[PDB]
Amino acid sequence: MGEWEIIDIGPFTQNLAKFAVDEENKIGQYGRLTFNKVIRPCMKKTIYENEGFREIKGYEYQLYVYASDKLFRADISEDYKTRGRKLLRFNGPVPPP
């Protein structure tokens, strides 16, 4: 759209949260913890062409799922072409505020 904006609640924020756990388990990349919680609320944005060689890669959803005892920074990027979900969860980690 232009800048950051609010994240959709209901079958969307939860869907993303589940996607994280599900897909992470399906691959086995780092190893998800155990249904802890999320800070809430969370926020979305549109990634720009940041040396990306393409005008608008898509949307991004930035969320801070609490796990173990850290706000693991967990993001997802979408594909502007359609509406894919590229696993960008489980990064940082981020310490608590």
Curated annotation (Swiss-Prot):
Pfam name, any one: Monellin
Record's description of how this protein is used: Natural monellin has not been mass marketed to the food industry, primarily due to the challenge of large-scale purification of the protein which is relatively sensitive to heat or acid treatment.
Name of this protein: Monellin chain B
Lineage: Eukaryota, Viridiplantae, Streptophyta, Embryophyta, Tracheophyta
Species annotation: Dioscoreophyllum cumminsii
Subunit structure: Heterodimer of an A chain and a B chain.
Described purpose of this protein according to its UniProt entry: Taste-modifying protein; intensely sweet-tasting protein.
Residues carrying the site annotation Blocking, abolishes the sweet taste: C42
Record keywords, A-Z: Taste-modifying protein
InterPro entries linked to this entry: Cystatin_sf (IPR046350), Monellin (IPR015283), Monellin_B (IPR002095), Sweet-Taste_Mod_sf (IPR053768)
Superkingdom assignment: Eukaryota
